[PDB]
Design a binder for these strands. Structure first.
Ligand SMILES: [Mg+2]
Ligand code: NA
Ligand code: NA
Length: 327
DNA sequence: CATCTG
DNA sequence: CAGATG
């Protein structure tokens, strides 16, 4: 946790770089388990050879750890922290919609910058376009003080369109957090489920409304169950308008709301532990359901959940207010 | 995993 | 349809 920090970090840099610049998935994937194992490792890795000793730890990584341990640095690491090529790929990628893949093309075309992008607004696709347009706003965290207003907003519109809607804002916002990075609303309706054959309108009608009233500004992607967009709190009495914020809306069949809701609320850490315990308690958990774990090895059959309560109960656990779902 | 591009 | 993104 700090005993092998630098090690795990450099390894991180290293891995990262393989996947993103080079297309080195194998290698990349290599650095990964390695930093993972050295991570769990209990003592102070005083040397390469010592580390080698670990699974996932071969000759090259060892060699690396050595140089690093021997000197406060790594050449290759330093060669990579320079190379404008490597750097550009790390940056272009900050643009929502631009992945590595793309980040590569652009560079090999000479687009290595924000300006490069603007000038070449043509090569960019819609999502990337927006992405570009809101670069700044996209990076700005979301203070709960807005979050509350936002939520206040979605909730009132979802309601008006249908009394039967059930909206929920998950995420860290849901978990207490003072600021979040994007709004994520869970959504269901009684009239939509596991079996029930579809109802796209279920998702579209609302989406509409939100943009009706102008909360939704752009559309990144809008499928029949997942909508990815841009929103923004109405700038009051002109002087101070709000940043544009990322937001996603997802339709969920009423029969798996809470698991989805539970799940989305996180944290990851709250998850696993929740997951792991459920396993003990003779169960199974994932995004949509909870299943009584048979003995023959495994087994399914969606136990019935009417609230986050119904879940905990199942695994016979202490109901956790969203706040305390931290770890 | 769902959506989009081309 | 593969392949990319979030
Ligand atoms: Mg968040
Ligand atoms: Na990106
Ligand atoms: Na292939």
């Amino acid at each position: 946790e700090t005993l092998n920090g630098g090690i795990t970090d450099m390894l991180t840099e290293l891995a990262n770089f393989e996947k993103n610049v080079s297309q080195a998935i194998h290698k990349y994937n290599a650095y990964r388990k390695a930093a993972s194992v050295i991570a769990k490792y209990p003592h102070k890795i005083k040397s390469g050879a010592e580390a080698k000793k670990l699974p996932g730890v071969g000759t090259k990584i060892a060699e690396k750890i050595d140089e690093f341990l021997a000197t406060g640095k790594l050449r290759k690491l330093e060669k990579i922290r320079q190379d404008d090529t490597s750097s550009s790929i790390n940056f272009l990628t900050r643009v929502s919609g631009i992945g590595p893949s793309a980040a590569r093309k652009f560079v090999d075309e000479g687009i290595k910058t924000l300006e490069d992008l603007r000038k070449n607004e043509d090569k960019l696709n819609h999502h990337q376009r927006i992405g570009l347009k809101y670069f700044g706003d996209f990076e700005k965290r979301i203070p709960r003080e807005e979050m509350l207003q936002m939520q206040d907003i979605v909730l009132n519109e979802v309601k008006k369109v249908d009394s039967e809607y059930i909206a929920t804002v998950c995420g860290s916002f849901r978990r207490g957090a003072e600021s979040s990075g994007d709004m994520d609303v869970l959504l269901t309706h009684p009239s939509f489920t596991s079996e029930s054959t579809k109802q796209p309108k279920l998702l579209h009608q609302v989406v509409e409304q939100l943009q009706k009233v102008h909360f939704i500004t752009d559309t990144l992607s809008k499928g029949e169950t997942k909508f990815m967009g841009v929103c923004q709190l109405p700038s009051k009495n002109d002087e101070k308008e709000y940043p544009h914020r990322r937001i996603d809306i997802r339709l969920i069949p009423k029969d798996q709301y809470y698991c989805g809701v539970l799940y989305f609320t996180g944290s990851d850490i709250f998850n696993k532990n929740m997951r792991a315990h459920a396993l003990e308690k003779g169960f199974t958990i994932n995004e949509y359901t909870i299943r009584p774990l048979g003995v023959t090895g495994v087994a399914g059959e969606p136990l019935p959940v009417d609230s986050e309560k119904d879940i905990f109960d199942y695994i016979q656990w202490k109901y956790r207010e969203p706040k305390d779902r931290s770890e």
